[PDB]
Amino acid sequence: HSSGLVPRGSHMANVAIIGTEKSGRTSLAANLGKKGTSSDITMYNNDKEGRNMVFVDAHSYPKTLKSLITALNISDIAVLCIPPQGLDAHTGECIIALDLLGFKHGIIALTRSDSTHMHAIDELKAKLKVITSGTVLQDWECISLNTNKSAKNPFEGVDELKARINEVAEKIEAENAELNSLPARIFIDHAFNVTGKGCVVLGVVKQGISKDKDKTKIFPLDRDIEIRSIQSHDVDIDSAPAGTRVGMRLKNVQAKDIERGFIISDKEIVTTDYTLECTVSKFTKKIEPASVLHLFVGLQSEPVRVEKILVDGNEVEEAKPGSTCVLELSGNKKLAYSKQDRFLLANLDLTQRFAAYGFSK
Numbered sequence: 001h002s003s004g005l006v007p008r009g010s011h012m013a014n015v016a017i018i019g020t021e022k023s024g025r026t027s028l029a030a031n032l033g034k035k036g037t038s039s040d041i042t043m044y045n046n047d048k049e050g051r052n053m054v055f056v057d058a059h060s061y062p063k064t065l066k067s068l069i070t071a072l073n074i075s076d077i078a079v080l081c082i083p084p085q086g087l088d089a090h091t092g093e094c095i096i097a098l099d100l101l102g103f104k105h106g107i108i109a110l111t112r113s114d115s116t117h118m119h120a121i122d123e124l125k126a127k128l129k130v131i132t133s134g135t136v137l138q139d140w141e142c143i144s145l146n147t148n149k150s151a152k153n154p155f156e157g158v159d160e161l162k163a164r165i166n167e168v169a170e171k172i173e174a175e176n177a178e179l180n181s182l183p184a185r186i187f188i189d190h191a192f193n194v195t196g197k198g199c200v201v202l203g204v205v206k207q208g209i210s211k212d213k214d215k216t217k218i219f220p221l222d223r224d225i226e227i228r229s230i231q232s233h234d235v236d237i238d239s240a241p242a243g244t245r246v247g248m249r250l251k252n253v254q255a256k257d258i259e260r261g262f263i264i265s266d267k268e269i270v271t272t273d274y275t276l277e278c279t280v281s282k283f284t285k286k287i288e289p290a291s292v293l294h295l296f297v298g299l300q301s302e303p304v305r306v307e308k309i310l311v312d313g314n315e316v317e318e319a320k321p322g323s324t325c326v327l328e329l330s331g332n333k334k335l336a337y338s339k340q341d342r343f344l345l346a347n348l349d350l351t352q353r354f355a356a357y358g359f360s361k
């Protein structure tokens with residue numbers, strides 16, 4: 001039994017469209033759905049073709065990492081856009097990030113196909129098979145495409161991209177369905193007041209099934225709240241299973257006290273210090289005590305200081321690139337997370353900024 005005249009169905013896909021500068025990312029996203037929410041990232045919604053699809057353009061990247069990380073942590077499928085001769089620094093950083101995130105499902109879009117030739121495209125695909133070997137992108141399909149209605153072959157590859165997205169989405173739907181039996185958790189990516197109905201948050205159910213009228217909590221505030229209503233692509237629904245992108249009206253909390261990264265659940269860890277079992281990127285500088293890094297977990301990001309570095313329980317003076325260690329970190333703001341949330345560490349001053357991934361010990 002469900003609300004409405006027809007169930008929503010288990011058909012949806014949250015897709016992140018990312019990549020280096022001038023890679024055709026925005027043009028692709030904009031041609032895949034209609035522009036909706038826009039901040040440092042932009043949602044393009046398309047629920048007119050079967051699945052409730054949301055494409056997130058991380059348009060503030062490469063300028064900021066949070067744009068990229070937020071887009072990836074609210075999506076289940078990544079589309080990495082690489083233009084002709086596009087093997088540059090940020091394309092490399094994107095590959096590293098996806099791999100440090102253990103991002104399972106994705107596709108590489110070899111954009112701007114009308115500006116190149118099949119033989120060059122075959123050569124770029126060959127190079128990529130190599131660059132992605134031994135990474136989570138190793139078996140991702142590479143699809144040549146363009147979004148130029150005036151090209152000799154207008155929009156070639158777009159139909160193929162859509163088809164592959166739907167296939168991958170089918171696998172994701174089954175994986176998310178398995179999470180329905182867990183306690184509910186919703187990551188909030190936006191929050192604002194709406195005249196006539198108050199506090200509204202937009203986010204995605206990460207696990208379990210959130211239900212209209214649930215009495216739960218919001219973290220890091222650790223405050224009781226009630227879910228007044230849940231909307232999916234503008235229609236009220238009685239429940240929202242894992243993977244569902246939602247809009248929710250909340251009772252007992254003001255939009256002004258909610259930030260991207262807050263979590264709705266019955267329980268979350270809230271701390272300002274962290275002890276993480278980490279794996280350091282081979283493509284970063286050795287990490288040392290007293291150094292400063294940037295931490296990302298869920299949809300939160302903040303600077304942190306390295307207080308202590310240990311290996312096999314013993315304290316050391318550095319963690320070299322490509323090593324595993326335990327990092328004791330300290331920050332100023334309270335962040336919310338559960339043990340299953342993967343942490344990312346970065347050094348915003350480097351060229352390739354991702355330094356490591358880790359989990360709370």
Ligand SMILES: Nc1nc2c(ncn2[C@@H]2O[C@H](COP(=O)(O)OP(=O)(O)O)[C@@H](O)[C@H]2O)c(=O)[nH]1
Binds near residue numbers: 019023028111114148
């Ligand atoms: N010829 C051609 N140009 C494209 C295509 N897609 C994007 N562009 C152009 O490439 C440049 C950057 O595109 P954009 O979508 O902004 O990429 P982004 O800035 O990384 O999001 C602009 O000139 C776009 O009009 C394409 O399909 N074919």
Ligand SMILES: [Mg+2]
Binds near residue numbers: 026057058
């Ligand atoms: Mg962009």
